Design a protein around this ligand. Structure first.
Ligand SMILES: *Cc1ccc(S(=O)(=O)N2CCCc3cc(OC)ccc32)cc1
Ligand SMILES: *Cc1ccc(S(=O)(=O)N2CCCc3cc(OC)ccc32)cc1
Ligand SMILES: [Ca+2]
Ligand SMILES: [Ca+2]
Ligand SMILES: [Ca+2]
Ligand SMILES: [Ca+2]
Ligand SMILES: [Cl-]
Ligand SMILES: [Cl-]
Lengths: 231, 9, 231, 9
């Protein structure tokens, strides 16, 4: 759909769309940029993630509102709440499938540097996690395992190739710990991962510049916030 | 609980 | 597009969409309800207005962000900012045209009670005002006059048929005063309308119940807030 | 400045 627009123009317009809080547009511009077939830079990977994370984040929040109403309804309100929750759920699944399709065709296979490959595998884990949040049928276990497998591959690369304060490594561990707690029914694994990640980052802060320290400590605080909620 | 945000803010 | 869904189901889903903060959906459900051809109740008129006011409100905010960037750009950034502002502007105009089309086919002509007819003419003024905010070409004066004419007809009916504290009469006066200040370059008319409206409402508050008093005073405070900004 | 909101809030 964006096939006739220049890559550089799509990137520029994604940045404008973020400033205007037009995240659906942002995501469409970044989908068009990925489909040009070239690898993405660090900055461009962040534009792609910001765009889709915000779109699906809004869908998730709406699905949760509707699912809560539906559960309370289960006086007969008729089929409308279930129908509308199903409509939002199908849209959410469609966006997740789109993101997963971009990662599979062909972002992951072309990503050789640890920073890019971990970034994309963390995204893959996240979008299977979002699918798992709404899954109920025969594929629910397989969707959960697909998230797990992507996060695990990202973890294995991150532990070999990045320092324990690297912000991508930290964000990956944060999100995988959320997976363990909220999806996999493994709260002890979630707590252990968050604690070990936090403590190993703390011990490496002394190596960092002021700007790297700020980024690592920001994500450490998120780990700590979850640990406070979970313990 | 909380996952990583898209931007630092 | 909503032709196969029951009117009552569209209304129910518009209420759900508002709770889920899915205002584009809400607007589509209410467009489908209007297109059933029946008149709208008070509650349903508010659903229609809430839905489109929120959709166009977001477009207006995005257009303002983009127009500010474009004006600052006028180093050569290329055509992208203008192109993207134009894209958002065309979408905004399309939503305004849709609302105006619902009012013209056939909400206004079937509205005989003063409360419904004033409500719809106030909306008509508002959506021509939103068109005027982005207008620059040969029709800009005609778009401004179309807003003025709709607001004026609503004012004439409201002054004959409603008490000076009626919340629709008050909201109409508020919005028409914004028109005068921001669109028509008539700040003195805007101030005079807001002051007279406020003072005539104040003098009628003694007739109201607690709940009506709350509604009238809420809108009076908005009039006062504008007067404080403008004087 | 401010126009009428869609809801009382
Ligand atoms: C998953 C993940 C993506 C990107 C980064 S980042 O170091 O590039 N960066 C950019 C935006 C998100 C973010 C948030 C924090 O603290 C909350 C720190 C750094 C970033 C990191 C992880
Ligand atoms: C233009 C207009 C529409 C609706 C009303 S109202 O009296 O039905 N009502 C409903 C939602 C908006 C609103 C806001 C206030 O105070 C800010 C008071 C009453 C309402 C009024 C005007
Ligand atoms: Ca009952
Ligand atoms: Ca490569
Ligand atoms: Ca220069
Ligand atoms: Ca009638
Ligand atoms: Cl539906
Ligand atoms: Cl564009």
């Amino acid at each position: 759909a964006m096939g006739s627009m220049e890559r550089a123009s799509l990137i520029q317009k994604a940045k404008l769309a973020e400033q205007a809080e037009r995240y659906e547009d942002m995501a469409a511009f970044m989908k068009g940029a990925v489909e040009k077939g070239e690898e993405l830079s660090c900055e461009e990977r962040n534009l792609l993630s910001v765009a889709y994370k915000n779109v699906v984040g809004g869908q998730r929040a709406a699905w949760r509102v509707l699912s809560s109403i539906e559960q309370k309804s289960n006086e007969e309100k008729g089929p409308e709440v279930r129908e509308y929750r199903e409509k939002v759920e199908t849209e959410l699944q469609g966006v997740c499938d789109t993101v997963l399709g971009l990662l599979d065709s062909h972002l992951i296979k072309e990503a050789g540097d640890a920073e890019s490959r971990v970034f994309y595998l963390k995204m893959k884990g996240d979008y299977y996690r979002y699918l798992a949040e709404v899954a109920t049928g025969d594929d629910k276990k397989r969707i959960i395992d697909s998230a797990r497998s992507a996060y695990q591959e990202a973890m294995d690369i991150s532990k070999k190739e990045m320092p324990p304060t690297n912000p991508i490594r930290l964000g990956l561990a944060l999100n995988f710990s959320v997976f363990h707690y909220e999806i996999a029914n493994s709260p002890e694994e979630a707590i252990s991962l968050a604690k070990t990640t936090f403590d190993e980052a703390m011990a490496d802060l002394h190596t960092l510049s002021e700007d790297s320290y700020k980024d690592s400590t920001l994500i450490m605080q998120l780990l700590r916030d979850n640990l406070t909620l979970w313990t | 609980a909380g996952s990583i945000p898209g931007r630092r803010s």
